Amino acid sequence: LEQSFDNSSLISSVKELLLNKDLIHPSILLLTSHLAHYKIVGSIPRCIAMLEVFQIVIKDYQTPKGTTLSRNLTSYLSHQIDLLKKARPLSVTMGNAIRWLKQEISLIDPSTPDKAAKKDLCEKIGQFAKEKIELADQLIIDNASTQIEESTTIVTYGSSKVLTELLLHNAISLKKNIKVIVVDSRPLFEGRKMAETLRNAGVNVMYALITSLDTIFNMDVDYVFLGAHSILSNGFLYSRAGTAMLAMSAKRRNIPVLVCCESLKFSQRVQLDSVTFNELADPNDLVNKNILDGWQELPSLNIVNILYDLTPPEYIKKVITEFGALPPSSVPVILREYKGSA
Amino acid sequence: TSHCRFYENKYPEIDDIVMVNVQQIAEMGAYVKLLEYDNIEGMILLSELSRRRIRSIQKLIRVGKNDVAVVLRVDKEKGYIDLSKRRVSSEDIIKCEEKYQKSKTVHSILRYCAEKFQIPLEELYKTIAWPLSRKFGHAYEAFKLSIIDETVWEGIEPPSKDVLDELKNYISVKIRADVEVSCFSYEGIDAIKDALKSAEDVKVKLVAAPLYVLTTQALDKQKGIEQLESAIEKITEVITKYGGVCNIT
């Protein structure tokens, strides 16, 4: 109660909406129970999953009697959004996809016989997942592969989103020597998902933990890469928690820090303090007769966890996006010149 | 050997309409190779591709894919030649696309002939290409009329007659039915004969006394929908007037 941060209402832990007011798609109930119960995702996996379940929910139209397709679908899809809003708070890859999707719903005209609706929403959202995600990531690979010399190391963090393919490309498709160090954190052990895939493909993975973060950097080490959840308007990064400690340790021990991001993921909002806009994530996960049971019913005890916190832009040497490399203080120029306009 | 000219001029002479694909775009525009003279290549300017400035994220989706392009200028002794597709009308797209589909379906019928009879590809190609593409339009509707009017083959000679036979060999569907004649009669044979005498005149085969395998030929695959059904109807008609029982799968 001294800082009162545990009563931050940016997430609501209410569950079990039983209301049959709308036709909630059973696939989207599978998607929400797949997100919120056992988190299998990053950010662009959530974006591709949300996008290819909205694919199915527009393919299964079921239009009402007197309402045109241009006058129902945004409210229907917003009530589809509300279940994910209950499940897990949204990324910017959530938001900059759904507002684009609503803008593309808006420019349809009341003459579609609900047969070309597929041909201008399914194909167009496939062009979205092609353009603003996948070939953009292909440009990320082809832009960041020239900035890695042979026989070096890489320190990623958590589950990567795009640069798993970068490490696989520079490991196998370009055959230059590389020694990836993957480090992750309690409780979402999502660096192991990178470690299984990278070592299954046959690259020198050396897993670690973030508590032992000192002895990684005392080896021969350079080129810390970082997956991003969003990049703010100032230059502050925003990603899975525990990123910023190895960011400040990496800048402290004068070895460079990079962020592989794409122009879909830049955000309009602004913050500079870490615990301001943030997600509380289910404090029963930090236990696994257990070690302790019942932080409740014991007065004066609490268990907190944080998913998201900010590296200051002094630490990131280079944000790379599909247009090119850039200093992190110069992200509003791609907020204004390229995001949305491309 | 592999592929060669259209019409015995080294380059696409000024202001004709050809087809290309874009290879890569860095700062000059694309290094478009000409799809009609395949091994050759030209280029094209950035401001010439549309009017819009091409995004890199837009630049990546277009490479490799092919399109139509008019030719502005040509060096007669250098292969360093320009293309253009801002000044291409909408009708010319479909016209040159039809001409190039025509071109590919008259190239594919000679590629394997030259590379499996093992002769120089260009010589017999040009001895076809002088009279048939100079007299009128080239080899597609020339060869669709050549198999019915054989004066094309004797108008000019090929160096061998095996490629002649293979070109005659190149350019020149069953719906299965297991109808079960489960009859218990005395005038059934006659009925069966009658059925045969209308459903076969498509491919009808006896298996035993009850089972018959008939594979009805379809032209649009959907034109045998009106055939099989008709046959079934005939069968139904047939057995009520004789005494037996026919059942259809």
Add this chain to the structure above:
Amino acid sequence: MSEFNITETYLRFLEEDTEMTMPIAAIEALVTLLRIKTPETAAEMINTIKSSTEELIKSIPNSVSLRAGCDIFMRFVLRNLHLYGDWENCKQHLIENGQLFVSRAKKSRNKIAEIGVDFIADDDIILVHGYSRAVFSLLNHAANKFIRFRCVVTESRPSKQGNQLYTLLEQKGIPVTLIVDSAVGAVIDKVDKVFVGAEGVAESGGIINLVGTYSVGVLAHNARKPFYVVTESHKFVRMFPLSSDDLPMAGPPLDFTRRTDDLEDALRGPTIDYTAQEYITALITDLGVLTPSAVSEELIKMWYD
């Protein structure tokens, strides 16, 4: 009939004047390439100039100012290739634009001074590093303004450039000393302002000139003295490193080989360092005073697509 590659056009007029520098010499050679060799077709023109830029980089690789000039020439022919004159006028329109750099970039250096004289205020002891002639083009007009200052010139080991300034503005009549390059930390507590000159600007604002401008920059930061850099607008280059180590000279900056008998041992470490955007605080170009995030935007807009 010249071929414009190495020395049949380029290295000739470098002996005409020891005032013109490398990148505008590259601009002059690349415009006089297509000022004559213009074979009436837009295809082989760009192939010729791209081949010429790559062989000219292939001539001398370790003089990255050359890469800056040879790449802003490509930006010039791209934007002058824009406005879409159907190549009918552009064979004349581009070449009559042409020499606007040698009428423009040659007289940029006093345009530097006309906006940079109002930095060196009264009684400012000044630290410069290396023979960066745009700094002297500022200082010449500063001393012609009759303003009172003092200058301190570092060594430029091993590239000798620090000995030139003391035989340059002494005879102009400025009280100047020549400090040795290792003595910066004992004097930069007293130096009011420090100027350098770049041989390149990265995509975030960086100084890619000489041996130890990162050392004098980090001395300027931990003395909290303002670290300005005088340059001009033909020094933008795409090369954006991330370490303090650029493209190599011929091998790594840390050699550990064996001297055979008596070969040279001074130039064995690096010779061109890099400065991050934090240590510089204002740079001077033709485009006005320019904070490093502004030079990042200016080099981020004309190089994307």
